[PDB]
Design a protein around this ligand. Sequence first.
Ligand SMILES: [Cl-]
Ligand SMILES: [Cl-]
Ligand SMILES: [Cl-]
Length: 229
Amino acid sequence: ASGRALFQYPMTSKIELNGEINGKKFKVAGEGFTPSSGRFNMHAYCTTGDLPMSWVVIASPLFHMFAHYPEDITHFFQECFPGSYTLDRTLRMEGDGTLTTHHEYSLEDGCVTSKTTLNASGFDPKGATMTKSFVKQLPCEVKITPHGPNGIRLTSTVLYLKEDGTIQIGTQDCIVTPVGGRKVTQPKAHFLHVQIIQKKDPNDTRDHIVQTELAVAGNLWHGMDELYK
Ligand SMILES: [Cl-]
Ligand SMILES: [Cl-]
Ligand SMILES: [Cl-]
């Protein structure tokens, strides 16, 4: 049993995230539900107190294996199982700060566990990230290309909406690397449409978020694959 045969829905998720931003250390944990292909939620909470940064900015750090892929595009993230993959992220909030994340995953009993670290240095203490002035991030297209002999790369430019109704940009670059000591067939260049919706639980006493991601793969530009050898 490998690849897509390991991703029979419903499934669950867990996260453990150890973070630091501008010297403030924090932890998040969460549990989530993946009812069906491409629709996955996460109820995360800061176990150290208040989260010292925007929940909107930490949204993308909070599971590409749950994306919905048509049959005719390789689902690289799923085809890495068994063996798994790492994700390395750089998220540059333009004019504000840069953060990196490192993720490791394991699959057991229908549950994907993410162990993630986040490092963030030199953010503007009056920027939207540290003052928590963001309302949401807008849906984007993530460009996925083959990267080196065995990886992929994911790039996106994300619009973050502040409370005054104006936009800040984040520039996001990820490398996925199989860690299963085996070759995984690389997909053709393609795009992922991604939307995040965040809300609060009526009762939870913790600093928390209830997040849903919709993530759908598509060959949005048939000619793009020609450019990536
Ligand atoms: Cl927030
Ligand atoms: Cl990404
Ligand atoms: Cl493909």
